[PDB]
Design a binder for this molecule. Structure first.
Ligand SMILES: Nc1ncnc2c1ncn2[C@H]1C[C@H](O)[C@@H](COP(=O)(O)O)O1
Lengths: 520, 122, 61, 122, 122, 32, 61
């Protein structure tokens, strides 16, 4: 009925010995996009050209972690458990209120239209292109008491060449072609979903460095050739070759059982403006050209933080493109001069297992040495996976995405979003929503032309998302106290992680999940 | 059948082996005799008989912009070695797609020489 | 003349993986610095890396 | 088994050794793999090949993650204390035993290929 | 060529190594590859070296007193340790410009590769 | 009731070995 | 009970008020005493003594 609420606002976290369940609700506003029509989209810009469509529909996105975890909760989670992975989810939209706007002259009036319908469907079948997954605004806001605007749905189409235009292959997906539920106030929508078994994300830092796992005290039983000649001078000395049983201490020489990492090199820049070479953002030598990129169908796509690699700590004066950058509290606009106002994610913790972003993978003999010809070593920058390699994935972040859909392709290797998160073949479905059109008074004599005059409307209501996370406690045997993340903030005039006098809420730092320790 | 060749020179090692078909039991037929056999393939990935209607590099929603920022330029101007020193960072906006941090890398790859069907060009 | 032959082609694959005659991409092959310019290396051979997705060669009649 | 604990008098010039019957040696094996594994790589200490050779049990020492080119410890570095684990205490006449089951693993190949990959064709 | 064991150009620098957290760790016999037979006059770091009966101390001048493991058998399936993986066109040939081939030294796994693992030893 | 929708918008095509079923919905305006 | 949600038009000079029927006010009481208790000391906001007196719900701080 019109008079009855169709759902209660509950946001909660319930913790278990084995599983924690998060639940949060938010209020949303839904405009009328593109005055009700699908629009072709395309621009051709050389290293950017793209093509696609913009839709009258909007969608709900809960892909950021902070959507379901209050800071404290995130804390609880990461200081206590080694791994976590999502198990099941369920969503419900309710208290739909459709508003109609009179828009008188000078003043715009708004009043409820009780008999109006907003339509929601979610598609399981994954027939619509998935977009919820990468790098984008629209997720519910972290702070509960913040109303948000449902994002408009638009999708990309395959672009052939450096020039944007469409081939027969390009396709059009029309949301109205799908069956969807129609609601009015007093109507509600609900759906459930079960995640697929997925590797627990590792929420620990290695307490051992891969290269040396051996017993410091003993020495291998293998021998290596130590020197072709005597002395410490490169090209002089007595001819004889000498072999020696690998002894305790010459660890760098120990034959090991594993190779540390897959790797792609990244350019490095210094946070101090002064240190960098001059590089423009446009023109023949715009930065893009010098930053590690992957050429695809004639178009440079700059590699996103790439195959997981070690990166300078957050405080460090140098930073690489490999690390993710978050706004930070103080920044006002879209652009800023000093990087002291930004937040940098860093994977120092990964260093124990795999190569550094700005440094190389290693160096290989790139030549066959000989008495008359000197040995030459080649610098290796790109290294595909090799038998016996072991690496760590990029960590997840409080404000980082949670899942991402694994491309529907013949081949994929070690799916783990590179931006961080769990790779799913069938990820939480995008739930679409749109305000049904309505018509302005219409002409008395019939005209075939499609109607174009519509009443102005917008809707609002609350959505509630609940996720059941499966986690695993630590159970370590380490004796010395671990590192844990605790605020440690100095005396503050207006406390952190809280709304302020203005009433504004902003997240102070970016937070990872690897504080606990574990050995290899 | 082929045998393993060691070196650039063909010759055989002890490793090389000889397989003699007569050493296997086989059915003998005459007119009026027939032979038959059956077999079951093993579960195998369906071959993909489709073309992708999306280009990997851009799967994102054209309309929105990432919430991550990247450093756009170490200096001002459009000239390679001149400009004001300051570094500038900017929130990745709709349109600068080539810059969007993505979740996946496109391909395993080995380069191949290329030739032109027009005799003249090579 | 190759006009008498038939060529198979994998244009369709282009959406997911690199071109045969062109390269995989270009990597920073160096640590830039105010006194030293940035150098990019051309990558020709690329083994599989975590997060890669590709299509297989098509079948033919 | 057959644990024999010896005690040494160590007189001047001459060292004497005699059994101490009531003395305990403690053994535990950890399944939980909570202690860093070292048995695995490149190291002496395995039982000797020839049966009639007595051997010296290896001392247990473990490595910690080293950050940088300089050795020093970070908070991350950890300390594992063996006494913190429950272990069995034996005296002569006491014995210890344990069992374990390997996990299914690919048979190691104990053959040499009689064909060269590059040419398998007819 | 003459190479010292210490100093700026100690052997370590020229032997294939993997840089980890600022520290060279010399690659242990690496991803399985073919290696010269045991008798051969040339040997690579890829092969494992065992003492051998006659050797008295921790160090020895002549390698005739050592034992070398070798993976000749693997040669049928994968590349040689000292030689390269292959050579790729590293360029787009043209009537006015000659074709250039690049020497490939490091090759990550590619779809369709098949290799053998290093053998086990007594 | 005034508050409840009286039907859902489903447009669909379901294909069978022998028969295909089409279904589509639209919104309309009716003057006087 | 008898929740009545009002919406105000606020025209120029004159402010108009009309019912919005579909609007929600949310109430919870917490048993768990997880929120800081304040009801207890020295403060205005209690229901008025005289029955026929309408009162303004106190703001929580
Ligand atoms: N996040 C995520 N989603 C899906 N699949 C993943 C993920 N991370 C790793 N993997 C895959 C990669 C390999 O297919 C497999 C190896 O299992 P392992 O147990 O890791 O040896 O796990």
């Amino acid at each position: 009925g019109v008079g009855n609420a169709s759902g209660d606002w509950h946001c909660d976290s319930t913790w278990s010995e084995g599983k924690v369940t998060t639940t949060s609700t938010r209020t949303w506003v839904l405009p009328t996009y593109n005055n009700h029509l699908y629009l072709r989209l395309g621009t051709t810009s050389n290293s950017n050209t793209y093509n696609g469509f913009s839709t009258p529909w909007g969608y709900f996105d809960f892909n950021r972690f902070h959507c379901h975890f209050s800071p404290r909760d995130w804390q609880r989670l990461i200081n206590n458990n080694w791994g976590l992975r999502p198990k099941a989810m369920r969503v419900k939209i309710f208290n739909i209120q459709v508003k109609e706007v009179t828009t008188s002259n000078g003043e715009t009036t708004v009043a409820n239209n009780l008999t109006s319908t907003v339509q929601i469907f979610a598609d399981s079948s994954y027939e619509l292109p998935y977009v919820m997954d990468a790098g984008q605004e629209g997720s519910l806001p972290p702070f509960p008491n913040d109303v948000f605007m449902v994002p408009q749905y638009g999708y990309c189409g395959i672009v052939t060449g450096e020039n944007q235009n469409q081939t027969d292959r390009n396709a059009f997906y029309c949301l109205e072609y799908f069956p969807s539920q129609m609601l009015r106030t007093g109507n509600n929508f609900e759906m459930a979903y079960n995640f697929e078994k997925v590797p627990f994300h590792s929420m620990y830092a290695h307490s051992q460095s891969l290269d040396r796992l051996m017993n410091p005290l003993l020495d291998q039983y293998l021998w290596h050739l130590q020197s072709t000649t005597s002395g410490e001078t490169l090209n002089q000395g007595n001819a004889a070759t000498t072999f020696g049983k690998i002894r305790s201490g010459d660890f760098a020489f120990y034959r090991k059982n594993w190779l540390p990492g897959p790797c792609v090199k990244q350019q490095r820049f210094s946070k101090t403006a002064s240190q960098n070479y001059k590089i423009p953002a446009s023109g023949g030598n715009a930065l893009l050209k010098y930053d590690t990129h992957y050429t695809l169908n004639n178009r440079w796509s700059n590699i996103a933080p790439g195959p997981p690699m070690a990166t300078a700590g957050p405080s460090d004066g140098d930073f690489s493109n490999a690390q993710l950058i978050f706004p930070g509290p103080s920044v006002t606009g879209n652009t800023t001069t000093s990087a002291n106002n930004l937040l940098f994610t860093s994977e120092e913790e990964i260093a124990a297992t795999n190569p550094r972003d700005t440094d190389m993978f290693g160096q290989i003999a790139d030549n066959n040495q000989n008495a008359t010809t000197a040995p030459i070593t080649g610098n290796v920058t790109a290294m595909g996976v090799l038998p016996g390699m072991v690496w760590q994935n990029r960590d997840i972040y409080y404000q980082g995405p949670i899942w991402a859909k694994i491309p529907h392709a013949d081949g994929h290797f070690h799916p783990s979003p590179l931006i961080g998160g769990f790779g799913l073949k069938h990820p939480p479905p995008q739930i679409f929503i749109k305000n049904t059109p309505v018509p302005a008074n219409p002409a008395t004599t019939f005209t075939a032309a499609r109607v174009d005059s519509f009443i102005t409307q917008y809707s609002t209501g609350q959505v509630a998302v609940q996720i059941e996370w499966e986690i695993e406690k630590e159970r370590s045997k380490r004796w010395n106290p671990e590192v844990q993340f605790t605020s440690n903030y100095g005396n503050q005039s207006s406390m952190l992680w809280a709304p302020d006098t203005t009433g504004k809420y902003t997240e102070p730092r970016v937070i990872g999940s690897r504080y606990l320790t574990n050995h290899l």
